[PDB]
RNA sequence: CCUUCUCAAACAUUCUGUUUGGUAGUGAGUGAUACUCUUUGGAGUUAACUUGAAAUUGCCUUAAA
């Protein structure tokens, strides 16, 4: 028995069980989203500096 | 937002006073409304023990803070000590994914899996936050269940523990039970026996079974820090065991598993190293 | 027409030449930098000089640091007049002690002491002191 | 931008740390030469913080003892001197919050005195060692297709026999026994353990997490000391609590 | 031993030189210069040797300072945690019987917070002419009070054993300060052959007391450092070669 | 939203319109370095929080219940003065050592005379940007002013150094505030129009 | 924009006695009396006094954003 090597991951099994129960939605992980550049501009306190 | 204001104003003492003046939300009302007829709550217990035994084994990491892992290990040790004191175990099934378990609970069956105590990688692809919320719900549910099971038996809860025992092996010996026949046969199996175990065999998964059967257990790992005057058996799995005492019996760890699966106390001549064990003779 | 040479003073301890180079380099390239130090010790004298490759950069850096409090010191800087030919300002280090004796024979210094005793007696007698022997 | 005040404070803290390292190396050379006539103290010392906090002191006595060094951030203004950087690289304590076991010895005790501010020290409980080994075990690889230059997690017990079996070492429980027992060839197990990278005490930067980090820094200031005397006893924090917090 | 009659003639000549007439206060100081082949091993050392004395030389010093603007005072320093235990009354009730008094007690944390701003550090240190400090805190003092205090023997801290048995036995500190006031004449040991002890104003002690003190000091110095030569002088006076040992030169 | 355009047009009018010298002395604020040093110094003497005040009240009550020297056992207080009327009263006495002045008080008239009265009495003063920063140390949403009538002897040297730094950075650097009326900046489109006109009038 | 060496031994039980070791400083300036050597090349020391930490030029990163 000391030779035994664990295989797989129990977390994947619990996630598959929660999905088979229907309790949780499943989908590809989302990434950071922004449809626009989010334009930056210098502050007036700095822009007026000479 | 109030803590953010207290931190941005520089009055850290006000932030400490605000942190002291708050309490976490309790789910117990949800546990009551969701599971009337407490045995019906036992019907869903299988997912709770599984998720808790899973989270207890994974290494501490970000989004865990390890406090949840500590509460899970505590609840698992308490449930194991209760199953051992009540000798509720009835079947076992070792597997590559872990050591499966089964035990009666007021006559209801309750299967559960115990992950092997080895490091495991985190894929990070799963939504960990939902697993943490499910773990919190299952923790509140199993906490209420263990409280009811302890009050029904009259044992004090939460059980007291000797801190020195936690510093040695942190095993099932922690959280000793005490009050404020046996199932015949599966309970009190190996009665009066005092087993010994080699270091290579697992100590937690095996000691819990021999203790739930009522047999005494000792491990060489306890000798690393610190009698063997009463041992009647010595589990061993080394490819070439060191010269055994003629008066002491020796057997492979597998012998306990089939003996629990059957309860017939199969002869010791089988499972003697290095002889190959029967594959599993699994109950299911 | 002020030169790009710059004078500095009231430097906090540990503001060695490496720090003055790392900080003033952000304003622009500097042909040289140095700091005064005691000849007998490595401690800084809390004043130094610098030279910018561009004269405008020197006055620009001087405009900001002229009253820049730092480590409790009211740091000051004044652009030097034309030229000023930054001077030696040697980077003195803590000189090690070194013995150079004894080398003369012990009999010679012993006779010199035996003579100097009577010489000091005659000298104190020259001052009117009555001490004898 | 360098923000001159920052580089100035850093240069001052580095000069102070270098003066402390010179004061420690002078006593180390005087002890290696056995010129005890001028040394400030004739014996090594060690101290154990305990929970205003209780404190105690005892001579090291030269007896070997297990220890688990844990890298820690700070002092904030001190850039690492090359001497301390080499002493840390010898212990492989890069990536702060990294930890590694060490066999304390009279030859190794002075080295801890130089890195003492950089790392906390203590005596982990055997259960803490079992947890550290079973939670974050990792192993180096060689030969052995998919490629050798790749670390692998410590799961297969058979690899411990394939690699450490020339010494008679067996499944990881035998390594745990060799580490707790401080047995022969224990250093080979230390090199084979791939020192654990303990997780940082708390992720945060939120308001509540900022309060937690403030309380942690306050406890660290209450515990850690920077006397820089070159003779102050090494601190011996209860490592089991730090591991229960970090693990 | 050095002849006592020669020291008597020397102190009489010094009394004559000072009897000739605030410059007189500068001119009245007495000292005993001493030479050696290599003091302190060539390494710098701020430590002072507590020379033995047959009489309370500090008592006349305070008795003269009480009428003088110098306003002689004794500073005290202890472990930073020990200041809370050492109430001023605990020293007052014990030291009034001897008539000595400590003007102030100062924690070592005070030197780094309130006695910084070097102008104030000198204005405060100048008031005291006999600093005292714990054996442990004294090593940290130079980083705190600075090196200017060590330039003068009056401002240099004197070690005191507050902890004979560990954890603050007060009687140790009491008897130690008493002996330091009544039977000790601390003096620094600097680099180079030159050295001298501060005997204080010539007017205070009687000439026989100065002779006995110079004799005990020369005896302890010959026993300890094998002084190459000895001299005594009034501040402006030329050194008097009252005694010298040629035998020390043979080891040079 | 109409309030947004209203405040924006108000700022544009404050920028475009000429200003008397007594106004616009604000925005010649102390430099961020000396201001951060002044706030690091003021932070040591923040007013006691109400919890600490109740703790000191319980301490003095326990002392009077058994001890002697009622209301005298406590150490002398040390906290920055912040009341506007109290700050003006501290001037012309004259116990004040320094008088901070927020540049962004909503009624500009409330503080326009403070710099002049400080120059008349000679008390050191400076116009730190932001009333909220002055109020954060005060344990109040806004205070508009700060002052130090007393300080610990250990901090007296740092206070004199900060006073000399504020003087060198403001009292001398901004001596010209008495003249050279502000608010003369023109609009961007009008600036480009006048520039193109001046270029075409005398250049190709 | 950091903050400084805040104790170690031996005889000894003395309600602390004795002995040893451990201590590199902000710099500049004024200035009186001298010692050692060293080979005139001059280095190490020796009462005294001023000061806003003052000053004109001596060949490892989750303490981020």
Residue numbers in the entry:
A (entry chain q): 406 to 455
B (entry chain n): 88 to 267, 351 to 396, 403 to 460
C (entry chain o): 88 to 220
D (entry chain t): 55 to 105, 127 to 322
E (entry chain K): 31 to 51, 71 to 301
F (entry chain G): 53 to 256
Task: List passages from the publication reporting this PDB structure.
To further decipher mechanisms of such an intrinsic quality control pathway we analysed here the contribution of three yeast large ribosomal subunit r-proteins rpL2 (uL2), rpL25 (uL23) and rpL34 (eL34) for intermediate nuclear subunit folding steps. Structure models obtained from single particle cryo-electron microscopy analyses provided evidence for specific and hierarchic effects on the stable positioning and remodelling of large ribosomal subunit domains.
Consistent with previous studies the latter was not positioned in this state as in mature ribosomes. Altogether states Nog1TAP-F, Nog1TAP-E and Nog1TAP-C recapitulate previously identified hallmarks of the transition from early intermediate to late intermediate LSU precursors.
